[PDB]
């Protein structure tokens, strides 16, 4: 998208799958691309960002607001709380390592929850506050 | 470019930081003692510059959580006191200075959170820590 | 959604169901997961919270604004409106107990109530405010 | 953090809350006698400090609605008087100093409720309770 | 939705059906549940409020802004105006009696009129603002 | 809690409600009176209270209608007088006080009403049904 | 809809039908109500209005933004701007007489112009602000 | 209620409407000479009323359309006079005061009208023809 | 729409198919109502516009927004942009004569360009700002 | 009505157009010099009229294009002078007065276009050309 | 659109394949029309400009606010940044020349990035702001 | 027209861009110094022009990135200085004169950026480059 | 209370007041005879009071209207007389002196008025009417 | 009503006003001849009027502008005369008194005017020319 | 008009002005011999005219800047001398006369400048070179 925008979803690709919690509760099940299978069924999904172009005269960045997503095939979603708890826990203020730049702030925003089709799956939207500095 | 988080003005009781502070701002200031003369090359403004006073602000405002140290902004305004403060720039470090109260107030909705401003202002020499 | 979701919808869901009105009222027909059977039909949810993310330099809280469905299966709807009337007689100013941290207000929001489908069935949502401090 | 219906401001008759108060605010001020010298470290600002005079302002706010304390606030203003006024901080505790009631104004429209803002100063010495 | 929800709607119903204009000119066709039947064509309905939650530290109100509608199948819809207008004849500054609370204030608001399918028949709601305090 | 519709100020020609009244507000006011002295028990703020002068002021806006007390309006600002004026709280009851008619002023556009603010002040001594 | 709404549409149809421009431009075909046959296919139609309640303490008027739609078959509509042509020069500073209260000023609004279904038929809305006072 | 539209100030050269007048406003104005006396019944501020000066203003803006009254506007700027005005209320009548031109200024975008404001205030006495 | 409408569309169709580019660009190919036949493809079309009715107290005006589409059968829509290019060279500053009143200004809006349907057509919007004066 | 292009402010070098004016504001004013009597028929305000003082100023903003005249208005604001401005109505005609440059001001953003104010204010007799 | 526009496309598109990054990223799979064949999938799309008019008295210019979307056949959407990183790169701050008149700035803007279509295929927008002066 | 980008001001340490400049705004001014006399031509204000004083201010803001030229500005506050500054503009050139550091600020909130403005203001003879 | 538009200074040519009459004010004195003997109950001073010699001056602002009346005062100046003046007071009644015209004194402004102070004092025995 | 543009001080050469003349003001005077007898109907003080002396002095001030009338009271002051000067007054007409230049003075600023006060005084007897 | 930068009061070692000339005024005066002999043509008061003594004097404001004519001014004050003095007035030209040094004083503040006034008179007879 901006040009750091290629080391963040894997930057927090990492700092996901290496948290104690959420590797307790959802697994191996987190991904970007689904891996075909069975579909496991309480899996998060991190892949939608927008950006709003926060630059300079000299340099500039960007304000990543990405989107993780919580999907989740059980009853009720008290399931998907926790595991969306151990998506917040794990990000906000999480000051990790980037490939080109560096981000200097990883705040919370928005985080709707919601069911998606036929009311048997659930979404818990989880926006992301990016400030990254290219 | 730095963290809005890691910048925080604290009070002393060793210093703490106030529990909610949502906006916080460092603000500087200096009155520019006009010493215009009549031969002026342009007729440019002259000014001195380094004799007139200098002056620092700070105003930090959130929500109201009681904390050891919000107890003592009350202490600090009713017992009127000049004791020390401490803003730290994220990249530059901590200033301390001895700051007033000079304003504060407590403000709550009947929907909204228990918030508060907190207003203050340079009562001594400063510092910086490099 | 924030950490202290996991706790919210599980303290708000046993402040229900311990009502004295409400379960003369609706019985013991409030939920989120729907328990499959005969589909009584006078039933409430409580599902769907938002997040807006109200934090702090030192410490972090939410609000979240977590919706409260009254569905009736009643030819008129006012039979729902004292069922709803019951639900926010049971919500404002709770001071409950929660699991992760504690909230400090639960207030109340907009409350729409409309005919969902074929104007057989009446949806009332209640818009609770919970700032919950984590 | 602290519920906002929590800390409430109250007149006597005993106190008790008068009845719509949307918005509530106490707000406390000092006014910064200035003490600047000659010689200075840096030149930084000096201020004494406690010697200056200090200040507390409430102003509470909503919807009229007519209680017997209501009516009170009617009663204080036209016959002048400086009672005892309290507005409790939900963690700190309760203040209980003599404000008087330095303009009140009530107002209504064609299609809203008749609301009023209350705006008071403090009187004289103020207290915590801690 | 709010406490007086219950009490607003029954009490709105009785002084509809009293009027004496409006009863020669729509009938007994004013509910909220339809009869099943014939199915009359010139009735009014009122169901769908919402409230915007105006309340006290000391109490609680509400604004329930409840719509009415006019439902006509005559062709043009010059009926549906002055059974219409009789509803805001009987409605704006009514001071009426509830049975939980009381309101204060029945104001006016948005009334739009259109038609709603294959252009047969006719939908007028009529938004009031209902001030009531618990 | 009260209707803003029941809240109405009148003029005399016997008293009349003005008649388009979107908007009114009655507000009172006071100066405060500052009575500071060296000797304070923790420096607070010390006021008199009873002895500063006390005011009204009411400012009633809406569309400007055509009525023989509208046209009264008109009469008391070209002829100066203080005559008798009366705004009723709802519940509290009315006030009927001399006020004068400070500054009024009609407005109208290329697509809205005719609308106008009227503005007003206390010119002496106020009452109070209950 | 508001009181005076049943005496509004019934003025406005009466002062169209009248003008003697658009009587040469569309004819008798000016009408709420479609007159059932071969549809002759330059009308206009006037029947959507809606609120915006401007109202006193003492009285209680109303602000009604009726639509007077003109639908032409005509291949261009050059032929319906001159219909919806006569339609502001005969209605826009009226001055009529109501059955109802009276209106203070019929003024005008936004006036869009469109094809409304497969580009064969075009419409013309022309919003009136229709300040009535009851 | 009355037409927006019906309102109009207008200019001599014998009078006509300005040619855009999208929004006016005639405003009239009182400064209240207070007379405040020791002896008062409740306090209450005693105003004298009629000996006051008393004022009138108006401003009117819109599109600025060239017309022969439009251009009498920038004559009377210029060559600094004191015409006489006349706006008429749409039900009470015409008012027929002279004025001045206090200030008028014309501008314009690079998208939008020339437009105008025209504001006046009043220079002598007026009247009102009921 | 307004008065003017009828008078406006007409001159700026005569302003078009006057300009000696747009002749060599587009062709004879501009239009409202489209001439049957084979359909040429790389036309343009004038007319929907819609008023903003900004009027005087003596007299009244109207602030035509009119859309003039640009649609190209190409395979590429650069050949769309100069066709659009030649539009608003030959509009912006028009100073034109009118039939009924006068414009004042012909000034230039937003002009969006993005693909109708099947991503085959190109719709290139361009909004000129008509004020005229009645 | 007359477009909005077409009324334009213009410096001299002959007098050419400032390469970006998206906004301009020709604004005429008067000080009223009060003469208010004893005696007056309804004691309204008397002002004498042509003996105050009156003024012009321009407003003109837009976009910063380097053109030969906007390097002008720099070299009247370094080296000041008082030279002749010119403000065309579109109907009325030109203005052809001496003004000065009062203040100017270059601002530009992150994101946006380098723009510009520039404020002048009358130093001399005008003139209109009609 | 405006009169650049025919020529700001054109010379983005040149900007674009002759950068050495996004060349050996997504090769020569840069266009507006696409060739048909096989469909490589990995490619960008630089059509879809609005127009902000901002003008002058003496002189006009335009904002364009063009779109250049990124789809990627891939099962992530980590290629599909790169890619969109490296027309991000090639592209704020270009100071490229154009054939009709000059760009003075060619800013970003929000730049969104979701599953189009059965989340099989990516868009990437990226809005850049060329503010060009004719 | 030109870029935003290009129009920089910059420190000394030889000057550099400070890091974070968002929005940034030369703004030149003069306060107009009145001859005004008795005989006048039409009445106009009569101004000397050349005579007055004029001033140069200079309000950059943006992102607080750290750099050893944004460490210069705290230098120059509080070691109370007037150095040499420089704002170029595009197409004009740069400005190159000493300016003082008036006020300074830096703000962060909870969940933004840390931010300042920094504004400045003449303290000397300025130049242009052409 | 009265109205100061009610008390008026007029001259005799039969008696007229004068055309601007913006602030006056008469002004009585007694010079206070000392009468301190060594005996006195506390040290205090006596005073003997009816040996005092006692006096009135009149000093009257105003704008300069030309009317036979102001023309009056000149030729009382240049031919120097004492004539009967007479000033009201509203409720008490006239007083009708002689005085003299003592200093008058014309001014003017660039852009104000002709305005005029009139000082007189008191010139022989002075009346009461009641 | 009578403008201050309009009373005019002007010199010999032939008569021509000042150049600079913003403020200006003809001053009378007589010395009041207290003729005080014992008897006085109620003690009040007698004056005799037509045996006190009486003068004239101009105060004006204004902007240098060099003409030959300011250049001719340098003449005035240095070779010291007492010419014949002359002031109008609006609507009374001309005073032609032999003044002389008692005190003058020249001032400027480091940003203002040349400017002058120029102060006469009553030399000889006056007259009016009606 | 002149500008005040032009006048210009300047000491001998060859004539320079002195450094800070903030506000400068050579004030000339003559104490008015009266001539009133008994008989005067209305009681007009008679003046002689080149009997009275004349005189100059000189008040110079400025800022402390250290150059040889500042310390010049101290070297005549200390080693009393009446030496030449030179002042411009802008379009008229030099004087040219012998003055004394009579008191001068320098000034600070905790915050301000180094300010100095300088206090002339005259002590020869003047010129005046056109």
Same mark, same amino acid.
């Given at each position: 998208?901006?040009?750091?925008?290629?080391?963040?979803?894997? /930057? @927090?690709?990492?700092?996901?799958?290496?948290?104690?919690?959420? #590797? +307790?509760?959802?697994? %191996? *099940?987190?991904?970007? $691309?689904?891996?075909?299978?069975?579909?496991?069924?309480?899996?998060?999904?991190?892949?939608?960002?927008?950006?709003?172009?926060?630059?300079?005269?000299?340099?500039?960045? /960007? @304000?990543?607001?990405?989107?993780?997503?919580?999907?989740?095939? #059980? +009853?009720?979603?008290? %399931? *998907?709380?926790?595991? $969306?708890?151990?998506?917040?826990?794990?990000?906000?203020?999480?000051?990790?390592?980037?490939?080109?730049?560096?981000?200097?702030?990883?705040?919370?925003?928005?985080?709707? /929850?919601?069911?998606?089709?036929?009311?048997?799956?659930?979404?818990?939207?989880?926006?992301?506050?990016?400030?990254?500095?290219? | 470019?730095?963290?809005?988080?890691?910048?925080?003005?604290?009070?002393?009781?060793?210093?703490?930081?106030?529990?909610?502070?949502?906006?916080?701002?460092?603000?500087?200031?200096?009155?520019?003692?006009?010493?215009?003369?009549?031969?002026?090359?342009?007729?440019?403004?002259?000014?001195?510059?380094?004799?007139?006073?200098?002056?620092?602000?700070?105003?930090?405002?959130?929500?109201?959580?009681?904390?050891?140290?919000?107890?003592?902004?009350?202490?600090?305004?009713?017992?009127?006191?000049?004791?020390?403060?401490?803003?730290?720039?994220?990249?530059?470090?901590?200033?301390?200075?001895?700051?007033?109260?000079?304003?504060?107030?407590?403000?709550?909705?009947?929907?909204?959170?228990?918030?508060?401003?907190?207003?203050?202002?340079?009562?001594?020499?400063?510092?910086?820590?490099?």
């Amino acid at each position: 998208s901006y040009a750091v925008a290629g080391a963040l979803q894997a /930057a @927090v690709y990492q700092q996901l799958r290496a948290d104690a919690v959420l #590797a +307790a509760l959802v697994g %191996t *099940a987190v991904y970007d $691309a689904v891996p075909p299978g069975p579909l496991a069924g309480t899996y998060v999904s991190l892949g939608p960002e927008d950006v709003a172009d926060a630059s300079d005269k000299t340099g500039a960045g /960007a @304000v990543h607001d990405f989107v993780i997503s919580v999907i989740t095939d #059980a +009853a009720g979603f008290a %399931t *998907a709380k926790a595991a $969306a708890a151990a998506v917040s826990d794990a990000l906000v203020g999480a000051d990790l390592v980037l490939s080109r730049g560096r981000l200097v702030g990883l705040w919370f925003l928005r985080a709707k /929850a919601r069911r998606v089709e036929k009311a048997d799956m659930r979404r818990i939207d989880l926006v992301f506050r990016a400030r990254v500095e290219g | 470019a730095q963290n809005g988080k890691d910048l925080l003005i604290k009070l002393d009781l060793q210093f703490e930081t106030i529990a909610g502070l949502r906006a916080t701002r460092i603000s500087f200031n200096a009155e520019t003692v006009d010493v215009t003369s009549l031969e002026s090359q342009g007729g440019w403004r002259e000014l001195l510059g380094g004799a007139g006073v200098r002056s620092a602000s700070i105003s930090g405002a959130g929500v109201f959580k009681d904390a050891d140290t919000d107890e003592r902004a009350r202490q600090i305004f009713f017992d009127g006191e000049v004791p020390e403060f401490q803003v730290i720039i994220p990249d530059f470090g901590i200033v301390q200075g001895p700051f007033m109260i000079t304003s504060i107030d407590y403000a709550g909705s009947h929907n909204g959170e228990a918030s508060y401003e907190l207003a203050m202002a340079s009562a001594g020499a400063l510092s910086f820590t490099a």
